[PDB]
Amino acid sequence: LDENRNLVNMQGMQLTGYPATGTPPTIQQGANPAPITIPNTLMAAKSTTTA
Amino acid sequence: GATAATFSLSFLNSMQQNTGANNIVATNQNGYKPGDLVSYQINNDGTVVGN
Amino acid sequence: GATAATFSLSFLNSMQQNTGANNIVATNQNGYKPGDLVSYQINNDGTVVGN
Numbered sequence: 743l744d745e746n747r748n749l750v751n752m753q754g755m756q757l758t759g760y761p762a763t764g765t766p767p768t769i770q771q772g773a774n775p776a777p778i779t780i781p782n783t784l785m786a787a788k789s790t791t792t793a
Numbered sequence: 794g795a796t797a798a799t800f801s802l803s804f805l806n807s808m809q810q811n812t813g814a815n816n817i818v819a820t821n822q823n824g825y826k827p828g829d830l831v832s833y834q835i836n837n838d839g840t841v842v843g844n
Numbered sequence: 845g846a847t848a849a850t851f852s853l854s855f856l857n858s859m860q861q862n863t864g865a866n867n868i869v870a871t872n873q874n875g876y877k878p879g880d881l882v883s884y885q886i887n888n889d890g891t892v893v894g895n
Contacts, residue, residue, distance in 0.1 A: 749841075754888075759839070759841070766823075769840055778841055780830075780833055780841070780843065782830060782869075784827045784828065784829060784830075784861070784863055785827055786827065786859070786861055787825075787826065787827055787861045787862070788823055788824060788825060789796075789798055789799075789800075789824075790798045790800040790822060790823055790824040791799070791800050791801065791823065792800065792801060792803075792822075792823060793800055793801065793802045793803065793821065793822045793823075826861075826862060826863065826864070827861045827862075827863040828863065828864075829863070
């Protein structure tokens with residue numbers, strides 16, 4: 743992980759994968775591949791709907 | 794001063810067969826306070842999961 | 845007796861989701877102190893940067 747916080751090998755190649763979208767987050771297998779990054783931001787609070 | 798939570802409570806899989814004394818065995822909810830980043834890992838399925 | 849210093853602070857993109865305690869997650873200023881030419885490097889992009 744570099745200062746940009748990306749999955750990078752020792753040469754400078756950006757690892758690609760299916761982006762995780764939706765609420766709650768989930769991985770869709772029909773989307774175009776996107777670079778996989780690990781943000782430092784925290785997830786927003788969730789309003790309870792199902793118990 | 795926050796918006797009230799509009800949630801639905803379902804008592805799924807409830808059985809009355811005189812099971813010892815009154816008690817609970819399961820509780821499922823989708824409510825959690827936000828947290829800070831602790832660790833990151835990748836499972837054998839390739840999906841990146843953070844804790 | 846130096847000249848007066850003024851600066852505009854931006855607090856945008858700040859969330860209050862009750863994530864436990866209080867802690868600063870980002871800090872930055874553009875007012876760099878004067879520096880001395882340490883060295884220079886050449887990166888693969890073709891540019892030259894003096895540090």
